[PDB]
Design an enzyme around this catalytic site. Structure first.
Site, mmCIF file in Angstrom:
data_model
loop_
_atom_site.group_PDB
_atom_site.id
_atom_site.type_symbol
_atom_site.label_atom_id
_atom_site.label_comp_id
_atom_site.label_asym_id
_atom_site.label_seq_id
_atom_site.Cartn_x
_atom_site.Cartn_y
_atom_site.Cartn_z
ATOM 1 N N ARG A 112 50.695 -77.805 32.163
ATOM 2 C CA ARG A 112 51.963 -77.123 32.436
ATOM 3 C C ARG A 112 52.875 -78.142 32.899
ATOM 4 N NH1 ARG A 112 52.144 -70.993 34.788
ATOM 5 N NH2 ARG A 112 50.597 -70.073 33.534
ATOM 6 N N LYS B 85 44.836 -76.593 34.023
ATOM 7 C CA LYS B 85 45.915 -76.010 33.317
ATOM 8 C C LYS B 85 47.295 -76.111 33.931
ATOM 9 C CE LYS B 85 42.931 -72.550 31.067
ATOM 10 N NZ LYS B 85 42.547 -70.846 30.678
ATOM 11 N N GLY C 141 41.746 -74.865 17.562
ATOM 12 C CA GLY C 141 40.570 -73.824 18.169
ATOM 13 C C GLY C 141 40.528 -72.571 17.429
ATOM 14 N N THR D 273 38.370 -71.323 15.434
ATOM 15 C CA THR D 273 37.061 -70.916 15.324
ATOM 16 C C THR D 273 36.674 -70.479 16.546
ATOM 17 O OG1 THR D 273 36.017 -73.096 15.410
ATOM 18 C CG2 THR D 273 36.539 -72.146 13.227
ATOM 19 N N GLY D 274 37.420 -70.646 17.613
ATOM 20 C CA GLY D 274 36.970 -70.250 19.010
ATOM 21 C C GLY D 274 36.876 -68.911 19.087
ATOM 22 N N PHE D 275 36.616 -68.300 20.583
ATOM 23 C CA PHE D 275 36.471 -66.880 20.708
ATOM 24 C C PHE D 275 37.874 -66.355 20.770
ATOM 25 C CE2 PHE D 275 36.208 -63.383 24.184
ATOM 26 C CZ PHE D 275 35.487 -62.581 23.153
ATOM 27 N N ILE D 276 38.843 -66.779 21.514
ATOM 28 C CA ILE D 276 40.276 -66.243 21.451
ATOM 29 C C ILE D 276 41.057 -66.720 20.234
ATOM 30 C CG2 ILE D 276 42.445 -66.497 22.376
ATOM 31 C CD1 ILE D 276 40.329 -65.100 24.435
ATOM 32 N N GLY D 277 40.889 -67.787 19.702
ATOM 33 C CA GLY D 277 41.505 -68.546 18.689
ATOM 34 C C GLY D 277 41.282 -67.901 17.325
HETATM 35 N N1 LIG Z 1 41.063 -63.493 29.250
HETATM 36 C C1 LIG Z 1 39.996 -63.736 28.772
HETATM 37 O O1 LIG Z 1 39.143 -62.791 29.063
HETATM 38 C C2 LIG Z 1 39.377 -65.227 28.506
HETATM 39 C C3 LIG Z 1 40.222 -66.193 28.148
HETATM 40 N N2 LIG Z 1 39.754 -67.563 27.901
HETATM 41 C C4 LIG Z 1 40.753 -68.615 27.715
HETATM 42 O O2 LIG Z 1 40.975 -68.663 26.420
HETATM 43 C C5 LIG Z 1 40.934 -70.057 26.180
HETATM 44 C C6 LIG Z 1 40.411 -70.214 24.929
HETATM 45 O O3 LIG Z 1 38.941 -70.535 25.276
HETATM 46 P P1 LIG Z 1 37.355 -69.790 24.469
HETATM 47 O O4 LIG Z 1 38.224 -68.962 23.115
HETATM 48 O O5 LIG Z 1 36.266 -69.582 25.036
HETATM 49 O O6 LIG Z 1 37.320 -70.972 23.479
HETATM 50 P P2 LIG Z 1 35.799 -71.485 22.787
HETATM 51 O O7 LIG Z 1 35.026 -72.590 23.313
HETATM 52 O O8 LIG Z 1 35.395 -70.300 22.321
HETATM 53 O O9 LIG Z 1 36.362 -72.427 21.417
HETATM 54 C C7 LIG Z 1 37.366 -73.304 21.859
HETATM 55 C C8 LIG Z 1 38.024 -74.048 20.414
HETATM 56 O O10 LIG Z 1 38.488 -75.327 20.609
HETATM 57 C C9 LIG Z 1 38.122 -76.142 19.566
HETATM 58 N N3 LIG Z 1 38.402 -77.270 20.214
HETATM 59 C C10 LIG Z 1 38.037 -78.015 21.478
HETATM 60 N N4 LIG Z 1 38.303 -79.191 21.607
HETATM 61 C C11 LIG Z 1 39.017 -79.577 20.462
HETATM 62 C C12 LIG Z 1 39.592 -80.656 20.398
HETATM 63 N N5 LIG Z 1 39.733 -81.854 21.325
HETATM 64 N N6 LIG Z 1 40.404 -80.786 19.103
HETATM 65 C C13 LIG Z 1 40.329 -79.862 18.220
HETATM 66 N N7 LIG Z 1 39.852 -78.586 18.455
HETATM 67 C C14 LIG Z 1 39.085 -78.606 19.790
HETATM 68 C C15 LIG Z 1 36.677 -75.870 19.507
HETATM 69 O O11 LIG Z 1 36.090 -76.288 18.317
HETATM 70 P P3 LIG Z 1 34.697 -76.962 18.137
HETATM 71 O O12 LIG Z 1 33.914 -75.723 18.054
HETATM 72 O O13 LIG Z 1 34.671 -77.746 16.830
HETATM 73 O O14 LIG Z 1 34.305 -77.821 19.269
HETATM 74 C C16 LIG Z 1 36.893 -74.412 19.586
HETATM 75 O O15 LIG Z 1 37.232 -73.667 18.202
HETATM 76 C C17 LIG Z 1 40.497 -70.757 27.333
HETATM 77 O O16 LIG Z 1 41.895 -71.318 27.768
HETATM 78 C C18 LIG Z 1 39.864 -69.791 28.320
HETATM 79 O O17 LIG Z 1 40.134 -69.982 29.742
HETATM 80 C C19 LIG Z 1 38.405 -67.503 27.176
HETATM 81 C C20 LIG Z 1 37.732 -66.476 27.140
HETATM 82 C C21 LIG Z 1 37.762 -65.146 28.122
#
Ligand SMILES: NC(=O)C1=CN([C@@H]2O[C@H](COP(=O)(O)OP(=O)(O)OC[C@H]3O[C@@H](n4cnc5c(N)ncnc54)[C@H](OP(=O)(O)O)[C@@H]3O)[C@@H](O)[C@H]2O)C=CC1
Length: 291
Positions: A123, A119, A7, A9-13
């Site tokens: 755990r 979640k 993950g 490329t995700g927001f946190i990732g």
């Molecule tokens: N504390 C805070 O303020 C916040 C915390 N959170 C938490 O942070 C965590 C991350 O979420 P957030 O950054 O939004 O996540 P995003 O939706 O922004 O990113 C998710 C990442 O996971 C990848 N992914 C999803 N499924 C798979 C899979 N099966 N195999 C491989 N890769 C996968 C996605 O890739 P792809 O694009 O290819 O699908 C993407 O890169 C969550 O647990 C959330 O609850 C998040 C935001 C606010």
């Protein structure tokens, strides 16, 4: 130890992946980014929900530390990842997708409660499978906490309830930096790591005032009541209603601040890494003003 991030490329990732590379850790980033690669990342291909495929990667690349940052809608995709790590048996630390509140202590309304159910399930599986773990409970990313979600408002502030309930706000870059510090620390083995930077413990009224200073003027303030937020949650619109439920838990119920972390299974980031300053909310809100 070699790190695999799922993950990235995700927001946190993105923050976690970037921090890992900055710390000179060998980092592998799972692909279903150019900046990541230029900084030294090795890209490997697969999906965490395919058990056999993950076992292959963990074995072939000799992975020691796995960090999952999959999104709220993909929490149960980690079930096959956990079976995979148990199979290969060589994992020194797993950080599941946590990155928020303490899911055992907090009791949000639906549909936020279902995400915490999932979640908690992950755990339970991690601990029963005997994989060494760290749970990152890093509270709220430093932003304007819009109830349904950029930048903080320039028309008027919507203040939840009395606007006097504290939360902890952490820069995305600090989420990354401090997360990666924990992955091979003896003191974070099989622990929840709570992010309680004392200078970033603010209520919504204080957040509004910080922003007013940055924009050089004041905005009117209006009340969004507890019932307003519960009505929004009760619509069960995904993921907006989930964020409404979490907003209620944080700013009406005080979920980030209403428990002691004195017990043996909880540690706190600022006491682990003393004299290592967190970026202030003033500082973060300063860089939005560069737009
Ligand atoms: N504390 C805070 O303020 C916040 C915390 N959170 C938490 O942070 C965590 C991350 O979420 P957030 O950054 O939004 O996540 P995003 O939706 O922004 O990113 C998710 C990442 O996971 C990848 N992914 C999803 N499924 C798979 C899979 N099966 N195999 C491989 N890769 C996968 C996605 O890739 P792809 O694009 O290819 O699908 C993407 O890169 C969550 O647990 C959330 O609850 C998040 C935001 C606010």
């Amino acid at each position: 130890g070699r790190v695999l991030i799922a993950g990235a490329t995700g927001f946190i990732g993105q923050f976690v992946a970037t921090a890992s590379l900055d710390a000179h850790r060998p980092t592998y980033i799972l692909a279903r980014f150019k900046a990541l690669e230029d900084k030294g990342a090795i890209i490997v291909y697969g999906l965490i929900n395919e058990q056999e495929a993950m076992e292959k990667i963990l074995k072939e690349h000799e992975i020691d530390i796995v960090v999952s940052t999959v999104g709220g809608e993909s929490i149960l995709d980690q079930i096959a990842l956990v079976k995979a790590m148990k199979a290969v048996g060589t994992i020194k630390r797993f950080l599941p997708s946590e990155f928020g509140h303490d899911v055992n202590r907090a009791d949000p309304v639906e549909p936020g409660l279902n995400m915490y159910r999932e979640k908690r399930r992950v755990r339970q599986l991690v601990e029963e499978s005997g994989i060494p773990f760290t749970y990152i409970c890093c509270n709220s990313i430093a932003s304007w906490p819009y109830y349904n979600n950029v930048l903080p408002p320039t028309d008027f502030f919507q203040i939840y309830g009395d606007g006097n309930v504290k939360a902890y706000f952490v820069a995305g870059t600090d989420i990354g930096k401090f997360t990666m510090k924990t992955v091979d620390d003896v003191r974070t083995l099989n622990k929840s790591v709570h992010f309680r930077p004392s200078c970033n413990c603010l209520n919504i009224n204080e957040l509004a005032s910080v922003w007013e200073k940055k924009i050089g003027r004041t905005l009117p303030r209006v009340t969004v009541t507890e019932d307003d937020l519960l009505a929004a949650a009760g619509e069960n619109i995904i993921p907006q209603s989930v964020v409404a439920a979490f907003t209620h838990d944080i700013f009406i119920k005080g979920c980030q601040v209403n428990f002691s972390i004195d017990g043996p299974e909880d540690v706190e980031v600022t006491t682990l890494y003393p004299e290592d300053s967190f970026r202030t909310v003033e500082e973060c809100f300063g860089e939005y003003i560069v737009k």
